[PDB]
Design an enzyme around this catalytic site. Structure first.
Site, PDB file in Angstrom:
ATOM      1  CD  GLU A  35     -84.667  38.017  56.508  1.00 14.65           C
ATOM      2  OE1 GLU A  35     -84.501  38.056  57.747  1.00 14.65           O
ATOM      3  OE2 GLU A  35     -84.450  36.990  55.828  1.00 14.65           O
ATOM      4  CG  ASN A  46     -78.797  35.035  65.409  1.00 19.81           C
ATOM      5  OD1 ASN A  46     -78.280  34.704  64.342  1.00 19.81           O
ATOM      6  ND2 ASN A  46     -79.930  35.724  65.472  1.00 19.81           N
ATOM      7  CG  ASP A  48     -74.843  32.285  66.860  1.00 16.25           C
ATOM      8  OD1 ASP A  48     -75.385  33.342  67.238  1.00 16.25           O
ATOM      9  OD2 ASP A  48     -74.554  32.069  65.664  1.00 16.25           O
ATOM     10  CB  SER A  50     -73.954  36.185  65.636  1.00 17.79           C
ATOM     11  OG  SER A  50     -75.043  35.331  65.326  1.00 17.79           O
ATOM     12  CG  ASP A  52     -79.521  38.111  62.413  1.00 16.83           C
ATOM     13  OD1 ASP A  52     -78.456  37.727  61.885  1.00 16.83           O
ATOM     14  OD2 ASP A  52     -80.332  37.334  62.957  1.00 16.83           O
ATOM     15  CG  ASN A  59     -75.512  36.519  61.803  1.00 16.90           C
ATOM     16  OD1 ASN A  59     -74.461  36.179  62.344  1.00 16.90           O
ATOM     17  ND2 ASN A  59     -76.702  36.295  62.347  1.00 16.90           N
ATOM     18  CG  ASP A 101     -70.603  34.861  48.621  1.00 10.88           C
ATOM     19  OD1 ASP A 101     -69.991  35.719  47.948  1.00 10.88           O
ATOM     20  OD2 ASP A 101     -70.294  34.570  49.795  1.00 10.88           O
TER      21      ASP A 101
END
EC number: 3.2.1.17
Length: 129
Positions: A35, A46, A48, A50, A52, A59, A101
């Site tokens: 990562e 990113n 879009d 956003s 990281d 994110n 999650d």
């Protein structure tokens, strides 16, 4: 800050990530390797809009608030700049919510591609711990 492999392994082990939600310590060390290359200051913007952040490339769209991402939720309830520190405490606490999650560690794409399914105990090899 750039970590050594064993040096990061001890820090993650101290914060209770070994076997947390069923994921062994070798998974977390391997995830941080691809990562962010053990670099706490790594940030990848990113397309879009956003970003990281930090050693685990968390994110900003869902997990943290960087102030520059439209429609963010800030699920970890922390500013994104906290994930850029040389102390991985904020990154670990946010990560614990993420892996809880149903998606588990599949939230980390580089982990899914490179570490998931391999012999992850190779990463903690030669480390006192």
């Amino acid at each position: 800050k750039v970590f050594g492999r064993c040096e990061l392994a001890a820090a993650m082990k101290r914060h209770g990530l070994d076997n947390y939600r069923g994921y062994s310590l070798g998974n977390w060390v391997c995830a941080a390797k691809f990562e962010s290359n053990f670099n706490t200051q790594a940030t990848n913007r990113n397309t879009d809009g956003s970003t990281d952040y930090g050693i685990l490339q968390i994110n900003s769209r869902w997990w943290c608030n960087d102030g520059r991402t439209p429609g963010s939720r800030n699920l970890c309830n922390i500013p994104c700049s906290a994930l850029l520190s040389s102390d991985i405490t904020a990154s670990v606490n946010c990560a614990k919510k993420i892996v809880s999650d149903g998606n588990g560690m599949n939230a980390w794409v580089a982990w899914r591609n490179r570490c998931k399914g391999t012999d992850v105990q190779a990463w903690i090899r030669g480390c006192r711990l």
